[PDB]
Amino acid sequence: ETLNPSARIMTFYPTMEEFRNFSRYIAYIESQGAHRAGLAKVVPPKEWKPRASYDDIDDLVIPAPIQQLVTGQSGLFTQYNIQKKAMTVREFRKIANSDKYCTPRYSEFEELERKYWKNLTFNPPIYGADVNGTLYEKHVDEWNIGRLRTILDLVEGVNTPYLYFGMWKTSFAWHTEDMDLYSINYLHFGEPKSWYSVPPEHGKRLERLAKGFFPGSAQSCEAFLRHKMTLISPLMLKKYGIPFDKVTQEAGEFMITFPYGYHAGFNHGFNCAESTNFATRRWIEYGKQAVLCSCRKDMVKISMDVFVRKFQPERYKLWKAGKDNTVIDHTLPTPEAAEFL
């Protein structure tokens, strides 16, 4: 409670020594209260690079590019997907940089952010989303998104890497991760990516507001935000007193999302990001209490039995019977942070 009381987005600059152990560094940022914002930025040391160059990926195939059609007014929107046929990075880059789809002229970020919210229902862009793969070279052992080696490995497509090829005005809707897990996002190259976040301790406030604005979606599915179709502007959040923060990610930077941390955002122009999900001992309780989508068969569901028997042996008999009345404290850091406190 005393650490990061304002629950604002924190930025970290680790040394090569600190950076070498991923699991230990996540425990350190939690001891500083980074988790309270629900989103944190990590700038890696200058000497670290995951790949020598990105000049040999023109013929990489994007199997399912998606055209994003948006409908709405007065800060409330719904995004619909149209799956297009397979295209290459070369073909996607030519479309992204053409006069029809390129980034507009602007002086400061606040101007581009106004242009995004004013024009998001016009000229639908194409997002090169959910590409199975990695851009990390084999010999890279530090912060390798393809092999983080957290306790989530005990499960084994949530523990595999994904690529995102963006263009101006492509967006990601308000959501938490599958099973309310953590996530890591690295921006390989190109134009920035802007993020919005709601502290996990205020997450139920956002859900109540969203349920009020979309009553039909709430009856059909309790966890309707997991469909990733709902867009809400910062001005609408301010008008209904929902606490939030904003941050811009640049090429070469990492973004970390925390359990039950709601996030949304947009791409400034042509770029490429890589992501995966991970876990700590603290996630276990969030995973047991996660509210899942019930209207879709193909949804992500992990059995918690293995994590409870291995890390909570005393509580397994009670949990499996239905006697676990544990209340989550969102301000508490992970148990692995003890050495820093």
Ligand X SMILES: O=c1[nH]cnc2c(-n3cc(C4CCN(C5CCCC5)CC4)cn3)nccc12
Q: Which residues are catalytic?
A: 157, 164, 175, 177, 263, 275
Contacts of 64 (CB under 8 A, 6+ apart): 83, 84, 86, 129, 130
Quickly count: other Cβ atoms within 10 Å of residue 291's Cβ: 12
Q: Is 272 annotated as a binding residue?
A: no
Q: Is residue 293 close enough to count as binding Zn ion by CB under 5 A?
A: yes
Minimum distance from residue 185 beta carbon to ligand X (Å): 6
Q: Is residue 262 close enough to count as binding ligand X by CB under 6 A?
A: no
Contacts of 166 (CB under 8 A, 6+ apart): 96, 127, 128, 190, 191, 193, 267, 269, 270, 271, 272, 273
Terminal-residue alpha carbon distance, the chain: 14
Minimum distance from residue 54 beta carbon to Cl ion (Å): 5
Site for Cl ion in 54-113 (CB under 5 A): 54
Which residue, 147 or 317, has its beta carbon nearer to ligand X?
147
Site for Zn ion in 201-230 (CB under 5 A): 221
Minimum distance from residue 129 beta carbon to ligand X (Å): 6
Residue from 179, 273, 293, 302 in contact with ligand X (CB under 6 A): 273
Q: Is 188 annotated as a binding residue?
A: no
Give 208-213's long-range contacts (Cβ < 8 A, gap of 24+). Answer: 209/240, 209/242, 210/174, 213/76
Which residue, 136 or 165, has its beta carbon nearer to ligand X?
165
Residue from 18, 111, 130, 142 in contact with ligand X (CB under 6 A): 130
Give whole-number Cα distances, 304 to 71, 184, 278, in Å. 38, 22, 15
Minimum distance from residue 138 beta carbon to Zn ion (Å): 27
Q: Which does 54 bind (CB under 5 to 8 A by kind): Zn ion, ligand X, Cl ion, none?
A: Cl ion
CA distance 151 to 280: 6
Residues 251-280: b if buried by 16+ CB within 10 A, e if exposed: eebbbbbbbbbbbbbbbbbbbbbbbbbbbb
Which residue, 126 or 337, has its beta carbon nearer to ligand X?
126
Q: Is residue 280 close enough to count as binding ligand X by CB under 6 A?
A: no
Q: Is residue 291 close enough to count as binding Zn ion by CB under 5 A?
A: no
Residue from 68, 79, 159, 185 in contact with ligand X (CB under 6 A): 185
Q: Is 139 annotated as a binding residue?
A: no
Q: Is residue 295 close enough to count as binding Zn ion by CB under 5 A?
A: yes
Closest to 170 measured CA to CA, from 87, 58, 79: 79
Segment contacting Cl ion (CB under 5 A): 32-40, 46-54, 106-114, 244-252?
46-54
What's the burial of 90, exposed, middle or buried (CB within 10 Å: 0-12/13-18/19+)?
exposed
Q: Are 116 and 105 in contact (CB under 8 A)?
A: no
- Name the residue type at position 269: G
Known binding-site residues equal 127, 175, 177, 185, 193, 221, 227-228, 263, 293, 295
**Which residues in this chain contact Zn ion in the complex, by CB under 5 A?**
221, 293, 295
Query: Which residues bind to ligand X, rule: CB under 6 A?
Result: 129-130, 162, 164, 172, 177, 185, 193, 263, 273
